[PDB]
Scaffold this active site. Structure first.
Site, PDB file in Angstrom:
ATOM      1  N   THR A  33       2.848   3.403   0.513  1.00 50.34           N
ATOM      2  CA  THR A  33       3.277   3.239  -0.871  1.00 50.34           C
ATOM      3  C   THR A  33       2.096   3.362  -1.824  1.00 50.34           C
ATOM      4  O   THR A  33       2.131   4.153  -2.774  1.00 50.34           O
ATOM      5  CB  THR A  33       3.963   1.883  -1.048  1.00 50.34           C
ATOM      6  OG1 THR A  33       5.011   1.745  -0.080  1.00 50.34           O
ATOM      7  CG2 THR A  33       4.548   1.757  -2.451  1.00 50.34           C
ATOM      8  N   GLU A  93      -5.235   6.005   7.525  1.00 53.53           N
ATOM      9  CA  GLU A  93      -5.638   5.757   6.145  1.00 53.53           C
ATOM     10  C   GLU A  93      -6.519   6.862   5.571  1.00 53.53           C
ATOM     11  O   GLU A  93      -6.363   7.177   4.377  1.00 53.53           O
ATOM     12  CB  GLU A  93      -6.325   4.390   6.053  1.00 53.53           C
ATOM     13  CG  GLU A  93      -5.456   3.260   6.578  1.00 53.53           C
ATOM     14  CD  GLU A  93      -5.782   1.921   5.948  1.00 53.53           C
ATOM     15  OE1 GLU A  93      -5.310   0.889   6.469  1.00 53.53           O
ATOM     16  OE2 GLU A  93      -6.500   1.894   4.927  1.00 53.53           O
ATOM     17  N   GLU A 111       9.062  -2.493  -0.033  1.00 58.63           N
ATOM     18  CA  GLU A 111       9.520  -3.557   0.835  1.00 58.63           C
ATOM     19  C   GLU A 111       9.422  -4.852   0.039  1.00 58.63           C
ATOM     20  O   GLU A 111       8.501  -5.006  -0.775  1.00 58.63           O
ATOM     21  CB  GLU A 111       8.681  -3.650   2.114  1.00 58.63           C
ATOM     22  CG  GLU A 111       8.580  -5.046   2.678  1.00 58.63           C
ATOM     23  CD  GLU A 111       7.195  -5.355   3.197  1.00 58.63           C
ATOM     24  OE1 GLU A 111       6.261  -4.578   2.908  1.00 58.63           O
ATOM     25  OE2 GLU A 111       7.040  -6.378   3.898  1.00 58.63           O
ATOM     26  N   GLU A 156     -12.130   4.219 -24.643  1.00 57.09           N
ATOM     27  CA  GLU A 156     -13.575   4.019 -24.652  1.00 57.09           C
ATOM     28  C   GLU A 156     -14.161   4.029 -23.244  1.00 57.09           C
ATOM     29  O   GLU A 156     -15.342   4.353 -23.071  1.00 57.09           O
ATOM     30  CB  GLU A 156     -13.913   2.713 -25.376  1.00 57.09           C
ATOM     31  CG  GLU A 156     -15.328   2.656 -25.930  1.00 57.09           C
ATOM     32  CD  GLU A 156     -15.443   1.764 -27.157  1.00 57.09           C
ATOM     33  OE1 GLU A 156     -14.387   1.344 -27.685  1.00 57.09           O
ATOM     34  OE2 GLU A 156     -16.587   1.488 -27.595  1.00 57.09           O
TER      35      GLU A 156
HETATM   36  N1  LIG Z   1      -8.302  -6.070  -0.952  1.00 52.97           N
HETATM   37  C1  LIG Z   1      -7.068  -6.072  -0.459  1.00 52.97           C
HETATM   38  N2  LIG Z   1      -6.667  -5.047   0.367  1.00 52.97           N
HETATM   39  C2  LIG Z   1      -5.415  -5.032   0.875  1.00 52.97           C
HETATM   40  C3  LIG Z   1      -4.518  -6.044   0.576  1.00 52.97           C
HETATM   41  N3  LIG Z   1      -3.360  -5.771   1.217  1.00 52.97           N
HETATM   42  C4  LIG Z   1      -3.505  -4.616   1.906  1.00 52.97           C
HETATM   43  N4  LIG Z   1      -4.779  -4.156   1.714  1.00 52.97           N
HETATM   44  C5  LIG Z   1      -5.365  -2.919   2.253  1.00 52.97           C
HETATM   45  O1  LIG Z   1      -4.433  -1.882   2.028  1.00 52.97           O
HETATM   46  C6  LIG Z   1      -4.395  -0.993   3.123  1.00 52.97           C
HETATM   47  C7  LIG Z   1      -2.965  -0.915   3.642  1.00 52.97           C
HETATM   48  O2  LIG Z   1      -2.129  -0.485   2.595  1.00 52.97           O
HETATM   49  P1  LIG Z   1      -0.974  -1.410   1.951  1.00 52.97           P
HETATM   50  O3  LIG Z   1      -1.234  -1.711   0.494  1.00 52.97           O
HETATM   51  O4  LIG Z   1      -0.816  -2.682   2.750  1.00 52.97           O
HETATM   52  O5  LIG Z   1       0.302  -0.439   2.141  1.00 52.97           O
HETATM   53  P2  LIG Z   1       1.482  -0.318   1.057  1.00 52.97           P
HETATM   54  O6  LIG Z   1       0.968   0.106  -0.294  1.00 52.97           O
HETATM   55  O7  LIG Z   1       2.225  -1.632   0.985  1.00 52.97           O
HETATM   56  O8  LIG Z   1       2.443   0.858   1.602  1.00 52.97           O
HETATM   57  P3  LIG Z   1       3.350   0.749   2.935  1.00 52.97           P
HETATM   58  O9  LIG Z   1       2.829   1.735   3.951  1.00 52.97           O
HETATM   59  O10 LIG Z   1       4.770   1.111   2.571  1.00 52.97           O
HETATM   60  O11 LIG Z   1       3.289  -0.658   3.488  1.00 52.97           O
HETATM   61  C8  LIG Z   1      -5.345  -1.537   4.171  1.00 52.97           C
HETATM   62  O12 LIG Z   1      -6.553  -0.819   4.075  1.00 52.97           O
HETATM   63  C9  LIG Z   1      -5.568  -2.974   3.755  1.00 52.97           C
HETATM   64  O13 LIG Z   1      -6.864  -3.390   4.105  1.00 52.97           O
HETATM   65  C10 LIG Z   1      -4.912  -7.084  -0.257  1.00 52.97           C
HETATM   66  O14 LIG Z   1      -4.128  -7.991  -0.533  1.00 52.97           O
HETATM   67  N5  LIG Z   1      -6.193  -7.090  -0.773  1.00 52.97           N
HETATM   68 MG   LIG Z   2       3.680  -2.501   2.533  1.00 57.40          MG
END
Ligand SMILES: Nc1nc2c(ncn2[C@@H]2O[C@H](COP(=O)(O)OP(=O)(O)OP(=O)(O)O)[C@@H](O)[C@H]2O)c(=O)[nH]1
Ligand SMILES: [Mg+2]
Ligand SMILES: Nc1ncnc2c1ncn2[C@@H]1O[C@H](COP(=O)(O)OP(=O)(O)CP(=O)(O)O)[C@@H](O)[C@H]1O
Ligand SMILES: Nc1nc2c(ncn2[C@@H]2O[C@H](COP(=O)(O)OP(=O)(O)O)[C@@H](O)[C@H]2O)c(=O)[nH]1
Ligand SMILES: Cn1cc(C(N)=O)c(C(F)F)n1
Ligand SMILES: [Ca+2]
Ligand SMILES: [Ca+2]
Ligand SMILES: [Ca+2]
Ligand SMILES: [Mg+2]
Ligand SMILES: [Mg+2]
Lengths: 425, 54, 352, 438
Positions: free
Chosen positions: D145, D183, D71, D254
């Site tokens: 993703t 998740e 996205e 390493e």
């Molecule tokens: N530390 C941290 N965690 C994040 C961040 N953005 C999302 N998360 C965590 O990532 C998880 C959700 O996955 P996303 O990375 O948002 O999903 P995606 O990889 O974009 O895949 P999609 O389902 O297509 O949206 C949740 O547990 C969030 O708390 C970030 O910017 N920093």
């Molecule tokens: Mg996403």
């Protein structure tokens, strides 16, 4: 650019849909003529979700108005925001449906559905990336019920991998137009069990009791009920109309709210609900206590009679997000007997800074509760009370239906009730 | 308590301190997995259309 | 409204604690698998500590210290005493013990025989006892051959320790006994000693010329009530409480329970618990711990106290269930989850 | 000099990637326009920072990074943000609709249609490398993703770049900053299919970063920006040895050698100290002994667990700032006599120490205060298995009812891949217990 195509069918569907576009149009700064006059960029951030952008910076709702008689849609076109809708998006017949599901689904509606899909196809062809559809309608009449479910069936055929969402008004004998409403509702529910991803169940009796008991309206009207549906529809769609990672698009909301494909019927709720002591500031505890109170819920089902599969709460306004988490986490930990223990963290919370018009802050409630079976039990009991004597069946057999199809609908919904029961234990 | 492999440069140094001594799927096979799931999606959609055609 | 879960249906102690919690009207019990709990009355074995303290907005508390088994296992205690600088060198209150693995499986076999041959050569009393944690299975003998051969016939770890040939005998009766002290350790790691102890007495005269009949040598409550013929003669249930035992020490020995025995017991409880504090403390942990311990002591005829073992899931004397359980709720549970004296415990101050 | 390509997958990986490269630039003296005044070799050079940055004829320093998200909204931030000029459009890849938090959707349905494009963009970066070391892959466990497309990307990288190492930076799911119920499903599916393709993985539990932000930084409700700035600090400490002159962890190989004697147990625990609030009046600067001692407190671990009840297989101490070897050894001797540090009997009880004299850089206007010395400890403890246990348990609760399973089967995944993945985790948990418990 994740667009949603909106459809509203029948008397109920168009009057509720009308007010829905009146409410959110105000929240996004769109006036009755389509011109933007807001004062914040958040209003336009996700505006393309529900509005097409025309020439001259005009915003036209992505909405299709459907009915089998002209009456109601002439009211919309002459209503407050009637001029904002695309004139081509009015598709209507002249015969009417006579509160008959078979006329909306098999005879009258069949003659008109193809031209409705011609408009849908035209609105989708202009979407950068279509999320899915949302339909507003009642289940107790003929057009929104019979033709609405026919539309869903044909929209799913042409767009099999899109999300289909509905706001469905369930009939109640206390707020009834005709005695055949249980027939129409039972026939529609099976269509919804098969072809919708999400259905917000709205019970006209719950809306009535809220206006009478809570809002202290001596004599409620359909207009009064539609005011609640408006506010609720505006609440559940806040996730989609403004920036936020929580319940981002329609498919993400479904994945987190629907553990089983057929149990996708939700109980919505709203708060506050104040009678005209209307200027008193509402604290976060009060917002949370009311939002979960059955009296503030619109499916007319007692949640303490079942268990929540999943819950999604949306808080609007400038408030303490810390104090929100504390109060939400307080409600879960204080009644963990009504939340299934085999879905960790099934209560999600989202915040939004723009409050509804005329309110400092508000909260909307979306629950996938097994108590919804009580709503289907009522309908089934009313259905069976008449069907055992084949009462009023001639209206339907005169349109080509057979008794066998009613027997199936009866069984299909009784199975739906049994499926809820096995997860409540 | 011994220090070994002391390396020093202008931007830092690194060493090792010892307290006590001790006592895949091919490209073809990935396409099949992806194509197998794509087929199961095509089968499930056909059953949906067949259901809608009835 | 606080919430708790019960995961040990066999615990008479926390069964009573659970009954009291509900009596307050401010605690609610949940199904044993519900993770949204404030307090866990956990299982004895394999308590999933790793799953505690990960619930947003919930302060979680548990009635066991992860890692306290090092103290409550026969072989673990021996290894802990011998290897801990805080104990081994100047541990004059724990009988000479050795860890012995059966030959069908480090092991202190040769080190044990060396100390055994020294005693035998010096005319000194050479009576040892072999026991294990997998017992109801105890043997007392003065021959090393019998002790070792009895352990090879089994299949679990054992411990051989010196048998106190000169125990203190009550009169009339000429009978052995042991002392049970209950100690509660709260989340802040305060060490509270229950003011009430119990002497589990033998109802048979102590006989030093026949270790075959183990009824006058083993003071366990179950053995006395099954294999003893004078059960309940001198005291009800072979249980003498501090009030009576104190009055005895004054009439017979011209001393008090505090001066002659309690000081040493309070010293031993401190030494054992302070030793493992860095390993089991939950001071900076994402969850909190407390635990009830059952210390068992022996007393010889010189009024010197010896530590026998520590119990991690002890039971209580019938007459003292109400007082102690209520105490567990006051200092251990309500200190973390307050509700809307003359303490029954004795705080053993120490440096953290 | 050998190059390292960084790959950012999903919202979590992309936004964390954006925060790391912001920090890398401030550390190496690179401006937002890509210029680097201190670099005296214009348009070339084989310096240490060149492992992460290439150079153009105009003097621009371009990260060796690829951003992938199904996205476009998160990557559009990068395109128009402060450091927009650093990257060229070929490095930024976006689809039109995401995986909806559905592993199967990101791995099969959508992944199949975009995998060849990503590999092509990565191949273009690899063609600029004279001796490519491997890849650093940033992603979340929970995202459709981050979980689903990453595991597919890892399988193909093993095929296209066989002899290259792959490290991960993985975000463990935490309910306090998550609105996704599935998740645990995604986390376990992606660990199963990625386990044999990752040489070393650093897990960061959002629950840990969250409490550190509330406790140490006095943020009542932290945002992703707060979490990511702290996370990229830890990442910087871990990748510093690849970007600066030194002799410890000088190449991706390493990391495995020093931290992973057993290939499956490749999840080192990370601890960082000190984290001090910038809004404070003025803090007393901590000593070598005090920050080293902090490395054994659960409060500053990237994954909450109790290393007192596990066993260490390796232990790396990475200091930045005013530290000399004398002070490190002094502190370690003290900690040994006080702490519970049990190593496995088939590994040496030792500590590899690295010192970089340049103290931690902090983003202007950020939340972290400038300190004179800081440390990141990398230790491979069996205690981190608690994280798998917690996760596996949540999996067991939902899968027993087959809840949400239909969403995955609907995208073409077989139900059996669930159990196949779970049995792998049960085997992974058994490996930890076989190494740590007696
Ligand atoms: N530390 C941290 N965690 C994040 C961040 N953005 C999302 N998360 C965590 O990532 C998880 C959700 O996955 P996303 O990375 O948002 O999903 P995606 O990889 O974009 O895949 P999609 O389902 O297509 O949206 C949740 O547990 C969030 O708390 C970030 O910017 N920093
Ligand atoms: Mg996403
Ligand atoms: N070294 C020793 N010298 C003298 N007597 C001993 C002894 N070791 C054990 N005993 C006797 O054995 C009895 C209890 O044995 P032990 O405590 O080892 O078994 P156990 O743990 O199953 C009983 P509990 O756990 O309830 O205290 C005591 O009453 C004591 O009299
Ligand atoms: N809430 C609400 N319900 C309505 C309204 N109008 C009709 N209904 C309900 O919808 C059912 C009648 O359906 P209707 O929309 O009139 O049938 P249709 O025109 O053929 O689609 C009955 O159960 C009514 O109680 C309305 O304006 N608001
Ligand atoms: C049948 N019916 C019920 C109502 C109502 N109570 O609000 C109306 C409305 F039109 F006045 N009609
Ligand atoms: Ca006609
Ligand atoms: Ca250069
Ligand atoms: Ca490989
Ligand atoms: Mg009507
Ligand atoms: Mg015992």
């Amino acid at each position: 650019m994740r667009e949603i195509v909106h459809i509203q069918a029948g008397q109920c569907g168009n009057q509720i849909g009308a007010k829905f576009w009146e409410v959110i149009s105000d929240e996004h700064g769109i006036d009755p003529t389509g011109s933007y006059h807001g004062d914040s960029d958040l209003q336009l951030e996700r505006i393309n979700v529900y509005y097409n952008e025309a020439t001259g910076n005009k915003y036209v709702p992505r909405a299709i108005l459907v009915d089998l008689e002209p009456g109601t849609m002439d009211s919309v076109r002459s209503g407050p925001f009637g001029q904002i809708f695309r004139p081509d998006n009015f598709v209507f017949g002249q015969s009417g449906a006579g509160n008959n599901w078979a006329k909306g689904h098999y005879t009258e509606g069949a003659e008109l559905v193809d031209s409705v899909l011609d408009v849908v196809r035209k609105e989708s062809e202009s979407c950068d990336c279509l999320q899915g559809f949302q339909l507003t309608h009642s289940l107790g009449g003929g057009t929104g019920s019979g033709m609405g479910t026919l539309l869903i069936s044909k929209i799913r055929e042409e767009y099999p991998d899109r999300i289909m969402n509905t706001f469905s008004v369930m009939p109640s004998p206390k707020v009834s137009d005709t005695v055949v409403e249980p027939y129409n509702a039972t026939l529609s529910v099976h269509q919804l069990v098969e072809n919708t991803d999400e259905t917000y169940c709205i019970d006209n009796e719950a809306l009535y009791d809220i206006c009478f008991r809570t809002l202290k309206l001596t004599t409620p009207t359909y207009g009064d009920l539609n005011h609640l549906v408006s506010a609720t529809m505006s609440g559940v769609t806040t996730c989609l109309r403004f920036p936020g990672q929580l319940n981002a698009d329609l498919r993400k909301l479904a994945v987190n709210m629907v553990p089983f494909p057929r149990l996708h019927f939700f109980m919505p709720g709203f708060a506050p609900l104040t009678s005209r002591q209307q200027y008193r500031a509402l604290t976060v505890p009060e917002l949370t206590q009311q939002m979960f109170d059955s009296k503030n819920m619109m499916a007319a089902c007692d949640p303490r009679h079942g268990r929540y599969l999943t819950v999604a709460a949306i808080f609007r306004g400038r408030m303490s997000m810390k104090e929100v988490d504390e109060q939400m986490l307080n409600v879960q930990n204080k009644n963990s007997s009504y939340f299934v223990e085999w879905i960790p963290n099934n209560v999600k919370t989202a915040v939004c800074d723009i409050p509804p018009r005329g309110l400092k802050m508000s909260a909307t409630f979306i629950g996938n509760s097994t108590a919804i079976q009580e709503l289907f039990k009522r309908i089934s009991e009313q259905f069976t009370a008449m069907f055992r004597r084949k009462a009023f069946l001639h209206w339907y057999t005169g349109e080509g239906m057979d008794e066998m199809e009613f027997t199936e609908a009866e069984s299909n919904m009784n199975d739906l009730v049994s499926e809820y029961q096995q997860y409540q234990d | 308590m011994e220090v070994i492999e002391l390396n020093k440069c202008t931007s830092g140094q690194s060493f090792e301190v010892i307290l006590k001594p001790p006592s895949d799927p091919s490209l073809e096979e990935i396409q099949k997995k992806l194509e197998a799931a794509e087929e199961r999606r095509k089968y499930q959609e056909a059953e949906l259309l067949k259901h809608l055609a009835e | 409204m606080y919430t708790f879960v019960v995961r040990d249906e066999n615990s008479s102690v926390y069964a009573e604690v659970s009954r009291l919690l509900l009596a307050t009207g401010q605690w609610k019990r949940l199904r044993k698998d519900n993770p949204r709990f404030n307090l866990m009355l956990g299982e004895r074995n394999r308590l999933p500590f790793g799953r505690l303290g990960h619930e947003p907005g919930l302060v979680q508390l548990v009635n066991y210290y992860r890692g306290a088994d090092k103290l409550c296992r026969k072989a673990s205690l021996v290894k802990l005493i011998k290897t801990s600088p805080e104990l081994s060198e100047s541990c004059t209150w724990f009988p000479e013990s050795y860890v012995i693995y059966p030959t069908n499986l480090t092991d202190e076999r040769e080190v044990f025989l060396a100390a055994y041959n020294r005693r035998r050569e010096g005319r000194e009393g050479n009576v040892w006892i072999a026991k294990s944690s997998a017992g109801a299975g105890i043997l007392i003998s003065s021959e090393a051959s019998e002790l070792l051969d009895f352990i090879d016939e089994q299949g679990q770890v054992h411990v051989i320790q010196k048998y106190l040939e000169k125990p203190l005998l009550l009169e009339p009766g000429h009978r052995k006994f042991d002392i049970r002290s209950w100690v509660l350790v709260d989340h802040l790691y305060n060490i509270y000693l229950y003011r009430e102890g119990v002497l589990r007495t033998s109802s048979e005269p102590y006989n030093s010329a026949n270790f075959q009949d183990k009824t006058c040598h083993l003071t366990n409550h179950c053995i006395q009530k099954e294999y003893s013929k004078n059960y309940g003669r001198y005291e009800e249930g072979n249980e003498m409480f501090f009030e009576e035992f104190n009055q005895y020490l004054m009439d017979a020995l011209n001393t008090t329970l505090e001066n002659s025995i309690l000081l040493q017991i309070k010293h031993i409880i401190r030494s054992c618990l302070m030793c493992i504090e860095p390993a089991i403390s939950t001071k900076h942990l994402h969850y909190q711990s407390f635990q009830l311990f059952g210390f068992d002591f022996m007393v010889d005829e010189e009024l010197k106290v010896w530590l026998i073992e520590v119990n991690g899931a002890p039971a209580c004397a019938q007459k003292l269930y109400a007082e102690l359980c209520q105490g567990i709720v006051d200092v251990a549970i309500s200190s973390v989850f307050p509700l809307a004296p003359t303490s029954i415990f004795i705080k053993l101050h120490h440096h953290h | 000099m050998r190059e390292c390509i960084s790959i950012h997958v999903g919202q979590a990986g992309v936004q964390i990637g954006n925060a790391c490269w912001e920090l890398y630039c401030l550390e190496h003296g690179i401006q937002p326009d890509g210029q680097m005044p201190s670099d005296k070799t214009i348009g070339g050079g084989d310096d240490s920072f060149n492992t992460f940055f290439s150079e153009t004829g105009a003097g621009k320093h371009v990260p060796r990074a690829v951003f992938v998200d199904l996205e476009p909204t998160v990557i559009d931030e990068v395109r128009t943000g402060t450091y927009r000029q650093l990257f060229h459009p070929e490095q930024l890849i976006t689809g039109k609709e995401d995986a909806a938090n559905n592993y199967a959707r990101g791995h099969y349905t959508i992944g199949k249609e975009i995998i060849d494009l990503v590999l092509d963009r990565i191949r273009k970066l690899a063609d600029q490398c004279t001796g490519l070391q491997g890849f650093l892959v940033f992603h979340s466990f929970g995202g459709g993703t981050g979980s689903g497309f990453t595991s597919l990307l890892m399988e193909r990288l093993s095929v296209d770049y066989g002899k290259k190492s792959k490290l991960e930076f993985s975000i463990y799911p935490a309910p306090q900053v998550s609105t996704a119920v599935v998740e645990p499903y995604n986390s376990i599916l992606t660990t199963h299919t990625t386990l044999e393709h990752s040489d070393c993985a650093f897990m960061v539990d959002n629950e840990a970063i969250y409490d550190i932000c509330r406790r140490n930084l006095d943020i009542e409700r932290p945002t992703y920006t707060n979490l990511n700035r702290l996370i990229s600090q830890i990442v910087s400490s871990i990748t510093a040895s690849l970007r600066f002159d030194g002799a410890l962890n000088v190449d991706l190989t390493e990391f495995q050698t020093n931290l992973v004697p057993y290939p499956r147990i490749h999840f080192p625990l990370a601890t960082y100290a000190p984290v001090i609030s910038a809004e404070k009046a003025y803090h007393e600067q901590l000593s070598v002994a005090e920050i080293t001692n902090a490395c054994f407190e659960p409060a500053n671990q990237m994954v909450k667990c109790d290393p007192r009840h596990g066993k260490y297989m390796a232990c790396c101490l990475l200091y930045r700032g005013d530290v000399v070897p004398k002070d490190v050894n002094a502190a370690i001797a003290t900690i040994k006599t006080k702490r519970s540090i049990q190593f496995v009997d088939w590994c040496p009880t030792g500590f590899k120490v690295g010192i970089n004299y340049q103290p931690p850089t902090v983003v202007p206007g950020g939340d972290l205060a400038k300190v004179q010395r800081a440390v990141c400890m990398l230790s491979n403890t069996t205690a981190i298995a608690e994280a798998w246990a917690r996760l596996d348990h949540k999996f067991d609760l939902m899968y027993a009812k087959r809840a949400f399973v239909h969403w995955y089967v609907g995208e073409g995944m077989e139900e059996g891949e669930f159990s196949e993945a779970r049995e792998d985790m049960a085997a992974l948990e058994k490996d930890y217990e076989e190494v740590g418990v007696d």
